Design a protein around this ligand. Structure first.
Ligand SMILES: O=C(O)c1cc(=O)[nH]c(=O)n1[C@@H]1O[C@H](COP(=O)(O)O)[C@@H](O)[C@H]1O
Ligand SMILES: O=C(O)c1cc(=O)[nH]c(=O)n1[C@@H]1O[C@H](COP(=O)(O)O)[C@@H](O)[C@H]1O
Lengths: 209, 209
């Protein structure tokens, strides 16, 4: 129930840490910090070297036509799933869902974000964003570890059969156990990759739950 | 280093056995016996329910244009890789490789087959089929558990960095340990899925190696 957020920017460090904690995870979330520094080929390299599923954390948030292009390039690169913002609206989300269907991949809908600024505009639209996801047939969602009461409400909207993952554990203040009361899996980045012993940090999280 | 060949024909039995042996495998090989009986949607169902990588054992062996169509449909259905015959020639293999590249997926090249009949025509062409794979950039291969001396020769041609999987273990007479002297992983079907206790059978194989 642990997903590693691999946001280190250099290939050597990213490969080292991911290899050290492989036994504690099954999925690696790779985003722009690593991809823009080392190239999209890093996705296929990780998939091959570690045999883990890869979620591309690209917070897709453009118009439908551009979202389609981003999703196509991302799935061509080997990602198993992509994270898409719901705030830009249904047409933008549908464009991503259409490419995922064409390529046999998945879309994760980012509802409410975990950082403080999410309270300004996203939080007020999050319940409706989750409902839009349900209406569009979305089965995978992202919600905040930092606000378990919001994570509970989002779980209420999407149902027990939807898959919900949650970032904000550790560095941002979220608790593994409390988050897993509602999410199926937790995303952890810095608490593991900036640790003196990433494997010990991962093991500690797994033990705490 | 164990791949389950799930050749049961009904969804209920296939799901039961795969769930029972999940802890001993990481990849499920699904072929036409199950897909033609239950539909291509079974691939996505397995991927979701078990979180395993799926190799579509479709022994692709048609002209380039048709191979492209088969690969596209197979990857759209969610398969992570597809098994392609090398005997029909380089253009037929290249067509599959092109679709795999477009979709961020992989091709496994079937060189020499494991059954007795493979000695009639395939065996005599197998070394050249493997060399053709190397020339085309193929990195994943299938070779016979039933003939470890042939598996050794094929490993010699493709190199240590290529990934080699091998069927024919158990029912067809192949030995897990001897096969793993050359292959990276073994494929096992009947010895596990027809057993009175599939999990015990899988565990026994893992223990024997
Ligand atoms: O889209 C995301 O992955 C994301 C959404 C969100 O609301 N909050 C959030 O933290 N993330 C990401 O999840 C990861 C969390 O990393 P840490 O705070 O280091 O554990 C980072 O890659 C973030 O960019
Ligand atoms: O393409 C294959 O997967 C295949 C190639 C080959 O040379 N030999 C071979 O047995 N297979 C398949 O691998 C599986 C082996 O199953 P069992 O003999 O029951 O363990 C079946 O799905 C076969 O169709």
């Amino acid at each position: 129930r642990l997903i590693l957020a691999m946001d280190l920017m250099n290939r050597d460090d990213a490969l080292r840490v991911t290899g050290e904690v492989r036994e504690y995870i099954d999925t690696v979330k790779i985003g722009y910090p690593l991809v823009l520094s080392e190239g999209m080929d890093i996705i296929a390299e990780f998939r091959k070297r570690f045999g883990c599923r890869i979620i591309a954390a690209f917070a897709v948030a453009d118009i439908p036509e551009t979202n389609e292009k981003i999703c196509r390039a991302t799935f061509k690169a080997g990602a198993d799933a992509i994270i898409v913002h719901g705030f830009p609206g249904a047409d933008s989300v549908r464009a991503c869902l259409n490419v995922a269907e064409e390529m046999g991949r998945e879309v994760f809908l980012l509802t409410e974000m975990s950082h403080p600024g999410a309270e300004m505009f996203i939080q007020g639209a999050a319940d409706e964003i989750a409902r839009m996801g349900v209406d569009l047939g979305v089965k995978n969602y992202v919600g905040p570890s930092t606000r378990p009461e919001r994570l509970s409400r989002l779980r209420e909207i999407i149902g027990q059969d939807s898959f919900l993952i949650s970032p904000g554990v550790g560095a941002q203040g979220g608790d593994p156990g409390e988050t897993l009361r509602f999410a199926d899996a937790i995303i952890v980045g810095r608490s593991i990759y900036l640790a003196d012993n990433p494997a010990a940090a991962a093991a500690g999280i797994i033990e705490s739950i």
